[PDB]
């Protein structure tokens, strides 16, 4: 019963990462939870969005542990405000 009541939670707590981590770190998250995207924040505390990494991004790389910062999407980064429909 509790599993059905908690199904549609609306993700307020998004799974994130930092440019310090390796590209392997990102694959772990994607493969573990069947997730296709990881938003990258500047630090664990001042969670400030710097980038996002995704599988189509992983396709363009031969297996590598390069810093996700030189791998992620940063220049034409698209966000929306909280409360947008």
Ligand X SMILES: Nc1ncnc2c1ncn2[C@@H]1O[C@H](COP(=O)(O)OP(=O)(O)OP(=O)(O)OP(=O)(O)OC[C@H]2O[C@@H](n3cnc4c(N)ncnc43)[C@H](O)[C@@H]2O)[C@@H](O)[C@H]1O
Give the binding site for another protein (CB under 8 A): 56-57, 60-61, 73
E strand or H helix that includes residue 58: helix 55-59
Contact characters 27-46, ligand X, x per CB under 6 A: --------xxxx--------
Span near ligand X by CB under 6 A; candidates 2-10, 20-28, 60-68, 71-79: 71-79
Q: In this structure, what are the phi and psi dihedrals at residue 67, rounded to the nearest 5 degrees?
A: -60, 140
Distances (CA, A) of 33 to 15, 27, 40: 10, 10, 17
60 binds, among another protein, ligand X, Mg ion, none (CB under 5 to 8 A by kind): another protein
Q: Which of 56, 65, 66, 70 binds ligand X (CB under 6 A)?
A: 56
In whole angstroms, what is the distance from residue 4 CA to residue 38 CA?
26
Binding residues for Mg ion, per CB under 5 A? 56
């Amino acid at each position: 019963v509790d599993k059905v009541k908690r199904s549609e939670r609306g993700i307020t707590n998004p799974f994130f990462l930092t440019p310090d981590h390796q590209v392997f770190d990102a694959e772990h998250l994607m493969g573990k939870y069947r997730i296709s995207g990881v938003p990258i924040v500047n630090n664990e505390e001042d969670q400030k969005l710097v980038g996002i990494i995704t599988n189509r991004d992983l396709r363009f790389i031969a297996d590598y542990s390069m810093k996700i910062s030189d791998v992620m999407t940063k220049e034409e980064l698209v966000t929306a405000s909280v409360g947008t429909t």
